[PDB]
Design a protein around this ligand. Structure first.
Ligand SMILES: [Zn+2]
Ligand SMILES: [Zn+2]
Lengths: 209, 179, 97, 116, 172, 302, 59, 40, 240
DNA sequence: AGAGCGGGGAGCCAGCAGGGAGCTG
RNA sequence: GAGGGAACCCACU
DNA sequence: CAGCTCCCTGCTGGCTCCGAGTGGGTTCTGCCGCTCT
């Protein structure tokens, strides 16, 4: 049904914009609390016909601390995504000299596609995201505490204070859903603020392995 | 716990018997052998198993089971430890004569009355000078050895007070009673 | 502190597990110093405020003066400082205790 | 309802359904020999999912003689009008959903079984 | 757990099993003693000397107006259709015995002695007893069909009607 | 509810089990569907899996060489209103199962068409249901039609999520699964709202649905929470499950012991089970691992 | 005394009446005196002949 | 020390029994107690 | 020492007069049991007339068994409560229960009023025979006495069917102990070996043997579990 | 020549066989 | 002023 | 564009674990026959 996919696309867009605001990219408040009727005004209502087109849903955001650093959020129109379309997106990344990009698939990609994203990850950072994973914001769940990506200076003063090596910290996987949400690679440290029933507040530090 | 067990006081384990005299009696009591029947007669006839061996079918299971029980109760062809189960719902008669079956003696209740009467108690009161014993009670058709499969087809009375008519009658078809 | 508590305990369970039993310590002080509860007390409320501040400075779990150390020390004794301020109020020490 | 098996007459075996487009009809053609047979009923495969309402064919009347089965006098027979009946439940896995009493007439030669 | 009475020999157990759903339907196979793979039961009935299908299903299904028994024996018949002769069935069983044979004659002898002296010894260990052994095997399949249809109820392992007591006699 | 509890649930927790005995969800409802029982029932029937077997009364193979001349003739009228293969699936449904699921007939038709690509054809009408399936455009068509019959009965989704077998609606009379809110006066006031307790877990699909609270909806499945929400979320979930197991009796264990167990169990970024497969794969010395379990294998690998 | 498990002819009230017929309290209690001081124990002690057996597990 | 003990066969004589029906059903519960009917 | 010598003066016993209840209490308990068995027969005849309502999530037999078990447990609790409220202040069962020294209130209930329902794997007594629990019962008997409800106290003595069903109930507990000790011991051993080297270090952090940080402070507050107590936050519950 | 020598459950992991995608001549 | 192992069974908390 | 290559998934087989601590007992090693005088 067109209404079901319209609701899906609006919810995916809202989660993407929350993700980009959490990562530090400049996202205006109008786009952050943007509602479903405003999606029916800004975009179409009949995606089978194509009034909301997924190519028309591509998001471009810029970082707050560096306006020359930008992120794409692509929405491929095919269910399974292979080398051809991600090379089209990679050529787009080259021709508008963007560094980071999110690709929101709706069923998945090929294994060779995942291998290729890992291959050009030194140059262009691509992140696979399923539609089903982005249908909600997982960081708003009650089990998920506050994750804050630490700057390298903060990590340096952390390991200086606690006299720690990097391997003596608790770990978090690079494929973790919240690590994928914040888009963090190996060697980054997440400050985790969570309420405590004995202390009130507790801050854990987790290194991305 | 629950693996090593003990017998009850009057539980007796069957020692074993030859299936043969039961088989000749079944041959001369209107049982049709499996080797001499069409299968079309099986669908409404009661199958007869002797020590787990399907030996034939019978078409009157009331009179066959009553005849077999009458023979066992008077120490005839059917010896006392032979177990004779009738599964009514599935039309089967199973006769077990093999060793290892555990059984116990129960009083026989027929028409809501004990077959154990005061003359048996009087004769057992002078066990030393009548030569009356337990085996004569077994021969008198008063007590009966019932094993575990046959206890699934009997209706036990806990006491003879259960045989008495009640204001809320639970059962009026008790088959045996506990000693 | 109350807003922080309602964030920490959204179910409204006021039962916590904390080191010093402040209510029983107050009762101990009342019995030890023969505190008449029907008379005016010679305890200035500013003494209550400043004593609770100095005591909260004196209960150190995480040591140092680094802002990381300060934040960890604040977090490690957040419930106990909240409960100590809620129990040794200038109002409660004047009219209740 | 359910349609039975069809048996070959020459080689004493099973038949199998087949559709002959010459007459565009359905024949039961044995595949051990050359025997063929036209079909009275077009139903080939049939399944029952919630059609388990008839537990009465599985009940045999002989259960009227069971001394362990409960007898009642408040449910008289419709066929012969006997006072005594035996009541029980259907004990299959496909009857765990129900605790319906099934009654069998206690009197000899009647054999009438009913429900409620 | 079949064992011929008044003869101390070890019990020879035959299984008659019905496969799980997750082909077309439910297949009944037979785990015979000294046959290390699962022979389909219709092939066992063929090897007992029953080429036909009213023979096998009269040994198994005693009432022919009953349709559900037929609808469950149908996959077992239709999976073992390619074997239609007695000695072909004997070859099919003996090819998967504990001792296979390069000669077809040796495999026929092997399957004959397995189905003669090892498969259900209590009903018969002697020749011309194919009809009583075949009726008992049909009874086993019939009980399997009754329990799989739900018409009959599964046996209880802890019921001492299902248990015997080896005393000093049988043990010695 | 058959919730595993006591020692077996403790063993299911500390040995990280890919299949718990009774995996379950605790679906909280977002909005007036939390209050209204009828749209709570709408969410219930949107969540619970419904195969075509859950509504079918009977199915049958029929021979109709000419669909114009139906053999059955109990459904001749609308079939001739409509006007291939001579073989036919005639499927009749149970109307109580058809109605309490709130399915409609064209939904079943379009689900058939989407599942099998509409290469076959389905024709329906009733007002005693009939659905008639024919195959459009080497081997007999009976075996293919029986196989797709089995696929429709035991492999088809009309509505719901496949891993969820059934859903338990109830209204909590206790605050342990209620909605404690703060009113305008600053009081804590319980709100009695409909909650669902499934008998399977698909946490992503359930969390993604409409009018389902994406905050408080949770599971007792530890692996599912780790895969969906992360490592700190599964640390919190493991603490909650262990606290439930311990404090069902009314027994109390101090929080720091549970916290130490969960921090040990989730320190290395993944779920380290309390087994040899979790502990003997650690970075500890070979002598500690050989003290625990698999002594000779650890010493040879060292 | 007969203590066969399932015996309606023996019940606690019958035994209590029988014990009261011998000038004892019907429920088996007696007025015991302290052996150290001679004073009556305020409670009345349930005392009677009970069959004890000595087990093989000696210290 | 009395032991409460009784059983009940659960369920679900409400019948207008006149003279001949009462007589025949009394005989249908005590058949075996007939010595000689007289001239019936 | 002081209390043992005062108990030399006072004395404490338990007798057969402590298991005795008043005759009015015995009439009340028998009336409650008769009412409960009437309710059970009412539920059985409701389910047999297909009038019983199948609660959602349960099959019809499961909700029938749940209704029967709820009735019988309410019977046990009410009979026990009447029996243990009828107790005088001189009662010794009452003294040892309300002192908390030995004995639950269920023990008073089972000694004085009703032993209660016997359970095997949490359900009532199974149909070990062909649809009977014992051969002293009719087939398909789902009443209280058939499926293990013991309506006698330990003072009254159990009937033989109740005695056997109580032996099944106690055998269940003995089995549960003798097969749960091994599983619990293996769980305890694995819990020990996974955390035997985790400890508070001198920088107050909690580290394992290879010095990885498990917790930055012990219990997140750095406090030992012995000296902490249950207290109330006075500013959480009240209104503004 | 006798004395003495000889000959059950439960649950997790790893390798191999099936897919489905992409690739090149 | 100190010379067997192993298997099994029973029992104890 | 057909056949080949190359990584996801399904299956079966292999492997390793199964509370702590105490008394007491019996029975077994070892199993018998030889080649030399
Ligand atoms: Zn033929
Ligand atoms: Zn009748």
């Amino acid at each position: 049904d067109d209404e079901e996919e319209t609701y899906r696309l609006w919810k995916i867009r809202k989660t993407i914009m929350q993700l980009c605001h959490d990562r530090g990219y400049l996202v205006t408040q109008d786009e952050l609390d943007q509602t479903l009727e405003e999606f029916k005004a800004q975009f179409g209502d009949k995606p089978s016909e194509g009034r909301p087109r997924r190519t028309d849903l591509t998001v471009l955001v810029a970082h707050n601390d560096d306006p020359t650093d930008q992120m794409f959020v692509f929405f491929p129109e095919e269910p399974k995504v292979g080398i051809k379309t991600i090379k089209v997106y990679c050529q787009r990344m080259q021709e508008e000299n963007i560094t980071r990009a999110l690709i929101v698939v709706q069923q998945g990609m090929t294994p060779s596609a995942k291998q290729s994203l890992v291959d050009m990850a030194p140059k262009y950072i691509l992140e696979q995201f399923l539609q089903q994973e982005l249908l909600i914001n997982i960081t708003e769940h009650e089990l998920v505490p506050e994750h804050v990506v630490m700057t390298k200076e903060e990590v340096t003063e952390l390991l200086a204070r606690y006299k720690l090596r990097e391997n003596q910290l608790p770990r978090i996987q690079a494929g973790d859903p919240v690590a994928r949400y914040f888009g963090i690679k190996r060697g980054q440290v997440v400050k985790i603020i969570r309420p405590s029933e004995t202390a009130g507040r507790y801050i854990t530090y987790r290194l991305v392995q | 716990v629950g693996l090593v067990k003990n017998l009850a006081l009057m539980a007796y384990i069957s020692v074993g018997s030859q299936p043969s005299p039961i088989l000749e009696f079944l041959e001369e009591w209107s049982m049709e052998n499996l080797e001499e029947i069409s299968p079309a007669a099986i669908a409404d006839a009661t199958k007869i198993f002797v020590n787990g061996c399907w030996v034939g079918i019978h078409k009157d299971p009331e009179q066959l089971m009553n005849t077999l029980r009458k023979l066992r109760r008077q120490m005839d062809i059917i010896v006392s430890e032979v177990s004779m189960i009738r599964d009514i719902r599935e039309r089967e008669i199973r006769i077990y004569t093999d060793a290892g079956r555990i059984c116990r003696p129960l009083l026989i209740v027929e028409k809501q009355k004990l077959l154990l009467k005061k003359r048996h108690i009087d004769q057992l009161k002078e066990r030393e000078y009548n030569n009356y014993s337990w085996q004569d009670l077994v021969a008198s058709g008063v007590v009966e050895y019932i094993d575990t499969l046959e206890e699934e087809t009997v209706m036990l009375a806990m006491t003879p007070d259960d045989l008495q008519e009640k204001e809320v009658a639970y059962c009026s078809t008790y088959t045996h009673c506990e000693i | 502190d109350r807003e922080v508590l309602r964030v920490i305990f959204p179910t409204g369970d006021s039962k916590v597990v904390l080191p010093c039993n402040l209510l029983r310590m107050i009762w101990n002080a009342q019995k030890i110093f023969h505190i008449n509860p029907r008379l005016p007390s010679d305890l200035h409320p500013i003494k209550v405020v400043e004593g609770v501040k100095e005591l909260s400075k004196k209960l150190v779990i995480v040591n140092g003066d680094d802002p990381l150390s300060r934040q960890a020390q604040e977090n490690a004794t957040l419930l106990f400082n909240i409960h100590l301020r809620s129990t040794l109020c200038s109002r409660r020490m004047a009219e209740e205790f | 309802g359910f349609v039975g098996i069809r048996f070959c007459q020459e080689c004493n075996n099973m038949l199998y359904p087949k559709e002959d487009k010459e007459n565009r009809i359905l024949l039961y053609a044995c595949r051990n020999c050359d025997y063929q047979q036209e079909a009275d009923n077009s139903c080939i495969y049939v399944n029952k999912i919630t059609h388990e309402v008839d537990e009465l064919t599985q009940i045999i009347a002989d259960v009227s003689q069971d001394p362990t089965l409960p007898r009642t006098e408040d449910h008289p027979c419709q066929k012969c009008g006997h006072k005594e009946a035996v009541f029980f439940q259907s004990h299959s896995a496909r009857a765990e959903d129900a605790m319906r009493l099934y009654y069998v007439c206690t009197a000899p030669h009647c054999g009438h079984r009913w429900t409620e | 757990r079949s064992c011929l009475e008044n003869s101390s020999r070890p019990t020879s157990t035959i299984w008659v099993s019905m496969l799980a759903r997750g082909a077309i339907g439910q297949r009944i196979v037979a785990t015979l003693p000294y046959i290390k793979q699962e022979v389909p039961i219709i092939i066992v009935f063929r090897a007992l000397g029953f080429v036909s299908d009213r023979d096998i299903l009269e040994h198994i299904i005693y009432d022919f107006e009953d349709p559900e028994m037929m609808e469950m024996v149908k996959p077992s018949l239709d999976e073992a259709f390619v074997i239609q002769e007695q000695n072909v069935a004997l070859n099919f069983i003996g090819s998967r015995g504990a001792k296979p044979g390069v000669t077809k004659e040796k495999r026929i002898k092997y399957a004959k002695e397995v189905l003669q002296k090892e498969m259900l010894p209590h009903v018969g260990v002697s020749d011309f007893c194919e009809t009583k052994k075949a009726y008992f095997l049909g009874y086993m399949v019939h009980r399997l069909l009754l329990a799989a249809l739900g018409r009959r109820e599964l046996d209880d392992r802890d019921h001492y009607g299902n248990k015997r007591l080896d005393l000093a006699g049988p043990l010695l | 509810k058959n919730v595993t509890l006591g020692v077996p649930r403790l063993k299911e927790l500390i040995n990280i089990s890919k299949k718990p005995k009774t995996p379950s969800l605790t679906v909280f409802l977002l909005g007036q569907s939390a209050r209204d029982a009828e749209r709570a029932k709408d969410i219930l029937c949107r969540l619970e899996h419904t195969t075509l077997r859950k509504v079918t009364a009977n199915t049958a193979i029929y021979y109709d060489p000419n669909p114009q001349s139906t053999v059955v003739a109990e459904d001749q009228e609308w079939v001739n209103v409509y006007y291939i293969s001579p073989w036919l699936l005639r499927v009749e449904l149970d109307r109580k199962h058809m109605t309490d699921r709130k399915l409609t007939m064209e939904q079943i038709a379009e689900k058939i068409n989407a599942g099998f690509g509409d290469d076959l054809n389905c024709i329906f009408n009733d007002d005693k249901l009939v659905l008639r399936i024919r195959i459009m455009n080497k081997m007999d068509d009976d075996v293919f039609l029986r196989c797709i019959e089995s696929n429709m009965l035991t492999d088809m989704t009309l509505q719901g999520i496949e891993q969820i077998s059934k859903v338990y609606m109830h209204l909590p009379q206790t605050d342990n699964k209620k909605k404690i809110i703060i009113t305008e006066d600053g009081e804590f006031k319980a709100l009695q709202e409909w909650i669902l307790e499934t008998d399977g877990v698909s946490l992503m699909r359930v969390l993604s649905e409409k009018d389902v609270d994406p905050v408080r909806t949770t599971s007792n499945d530890i692996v599912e929470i780790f895969t969906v929400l992360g490592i700190e979320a599964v640390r919190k979930a493991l603490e909650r499950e262990l606290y439930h197991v311990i404090s069902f009796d009314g027994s109390y264990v101090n929080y720091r012991h549970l916290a130490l167990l969960c921090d040990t169990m989730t320190c290395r970024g993944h779920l380290m089970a309390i087994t040899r497969h979790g502990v003997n794969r650690q970075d500890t010395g070979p002598l500690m691992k050989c003290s625990f379990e698999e002594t000779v294998d650890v010493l040879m690998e060292a | 005394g007969d203590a066969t498990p399932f015996n309606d002819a023996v019940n606690v009230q019958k035994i209590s009446n029988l014990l009261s017929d011998y000038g004892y309290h019907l429920r088996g209690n007696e007025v015991l005196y302290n052996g150290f001081t001679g004073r009556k124990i305020t409670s009345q002690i349930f005392i009677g002949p009970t069959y004890y057996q000595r087990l093989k597990h000696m210290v | 020390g009395r032991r409460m003990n009784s059983k009940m066969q659960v369920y679900s004589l409400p019948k207008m029994m006149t003279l001949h029906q009462q007589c025949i059903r009394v005989l249908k519960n005590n058949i075996d107690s007939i010595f000689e009917v007289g001239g019936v | 020492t002081v209390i043992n010598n005062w108990l030399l003066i006072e004395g404490h016993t338990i007798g057969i007069g402590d298991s005795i209840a008043d005759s009015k209490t015995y009439q009340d308990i028998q009336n409650t049991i008769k009412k409960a068995k009437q309710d059970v027969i009412e539920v059985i005849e409701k389910a047999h007339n297909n009038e019983l309502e199948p609660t959602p999530g349960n099959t019809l037999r499961q909700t029938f068994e749940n209704q029967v078990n709820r009735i019988l447990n309410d019977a046990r609790d009410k009979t026990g409560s009447s029996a243990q409220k009828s107790l005088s202040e001189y009662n010794n069962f009452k003294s040892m229960v309300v002192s908390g020294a030995k004995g639950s209130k269920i023990n008073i209930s089972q000694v004085i009023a009703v032993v209660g329902q016997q359970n095997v794997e949490g359900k009532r007594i199974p149909f070990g025979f062909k649809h009977r629990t014992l051969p002293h019962f009719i087939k398909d008997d789902y009443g209280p006495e058939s499926r293990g409800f013991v309506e006698n106290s330990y003072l009254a003595g159990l009937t033989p069917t109740e005695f056997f069903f109580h032996a099944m109930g106690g055998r269940e507990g003995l089995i549960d102990t003798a097969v749960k000790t091994a599983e619990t011991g293996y769980i305890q051993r694995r819990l020990i070996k996974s955390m035997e080297s985790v400890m508070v270090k001198y920088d107050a952090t909690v580290r394992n043997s290879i010095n990885q940080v498990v917790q930055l402070r012990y219990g997140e507050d750095g406090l030992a579990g012995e000296s902490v107590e249950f207290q109330n936050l006075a500013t959480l519950k009240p209104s503004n």
